[PDB]
Structure 1
């Protein structure tokens, strides 16, 4: 299958997923000297008070913290978006070294990791229908740098041992995703894609300007996860990021001067 390894990584994905070479692929480099302030944008509305997390799953590529998306419980609105987008899951991308791991870059800077909070547009009824639409998803992306610990990430770090290998899951109720956000909601936005196969061009990206800090210990525990299943040779789950793709005929807009 596709992955991040030596012979199935991002540079191969186009063979099975030709849209990998499409017009609106993600991630991209965010050039802060060409992104333009857009006064038509509004503030983001992140409404996560009623979020219902359910489960955490190692899917062999990353791990997903999954939410109940059968009601408007944890929603994203505003910003560049029209309508209401429901949180379905979050996951991360991270490196083997603190100098790489993010998917988006900022003036070519790579962060240690990147958090993706994935939301789907309720007008399309379910996730699977939403990914078939150009405005089906909204992904809130948040950079991680290594520095101080992020207290609100620790409950995630402490369950990772229970989902070491591909296909393992664990109960993960009562997790508050608000504890993963930086102070500021200033953002960049542009139209793009999922960053894993099937690479569908269905995403309004909203990338926060302010990174969150995590500790070296927290990142190290991410790097103990495994791509492989139980009883297979160990392959550490690191460097599960796609590199920046060509911007093509797109503009990145900023919510801030």
Structure 2
């Protein structure tokens, strides 16, 4: 029926409805640190989120998205391996039922508790819908979460979750600053890949940060309280909404550091 992360509609079945699932540039992937090529030509990332305007948070049935106003160059990413300006449209997470799983990308086969995705689209394409149809249409910043100390800047997010518990619920969510979710270092790995949920379009330049951010056990615990189902439907906790690593194929992972 429709795709999800259960046994009957999970990642292993997606190819039946979205054949690109077995494509040449699918994500996520395992990052082999000893095979990644340091590339001295990659520039430092430029994250300008001081003018970021958050608008709302929504449970879409597969994760929760925080959405931003992308009608102007308010929150942008540039530099790194990118040409042009990429505007932030939304962020969301992937997480596990247990602390030893949850991330999509892995590092030398290590899985983290969760993975944050900051999605941006290439302004030359005019809108999100056109950007996904192009090989360089999106730039996703991925950040790993490990469980340790609480992340103060994530608390406002944790606290509104009760109000968007089931699929299709939304809540006003203004004045959230995404700078509070960045690690100290912007060192990264980069490779050409795809969206990690259907339609799995291969339109993404991934920028994966080397340094994880820490969140407390209690913080991640609140994520696991969301539901995949809509209100008044049988309860299915939103856990394990991650796609496993895909074959690298003909691709090189480049590192911005040594």
Structure-1-length-normalised TM-score: 1.00
Residue aligned with 2:130, SS: helix
- Superposed CA deviations along residues 152-208 of structure 1, whole A, max 9, x for unmatched, are 000000000000000000000000000000000000000000000000000000000
Moved over 4 A (4+): none
The separation in 2 between residues aligned to 1:6 and 1:230, in whole angstroms, is: 22
The separation in 2 between residues aligned to 1:22 and 1:211, in whole angstroms, is: 29
The separation in 2 between residues aligned to 1:153 and 1:25, in whole angstroms, is: 29
The separation in 1 between residues aligned to 2:12 and 2:152, in whole angstroms, is: 36
Shift of 1:220: 0.3
The separation in 1 between residues aligned to 2:247 and 2:35, in whole angstroms, is: 15
Shift of 1:240: 0.1
RMSD: 0.3
Residue aligned with 1:158, SS: helix
Residue aligned with 1:178, SS: helix
The separation in 2 between residues aligned to 1:49 and 1:61, in whole angstroms, is: 29
2:255 is aligned to 254
Shift of 1:6: 1.5
Residue aligned with 1:159, SS: helix
Shift of 1:211: 0.1
Q: Which runs of 5+ in 1 are unaligned?
A: none
The separation in 1 between residues aligned to 2:251 and 2:41, in whole angstroms, is: 17
Residue aligned with 1:207, SS: strand
- Superposed CA deviations along residues 25-64 of structure 1, whole A, max 9, x for unmatched, are 0000000010010011000000000000000000000000
Residue aligned with 1:244, SS: coil
Matched, 1:33 2:34: yes
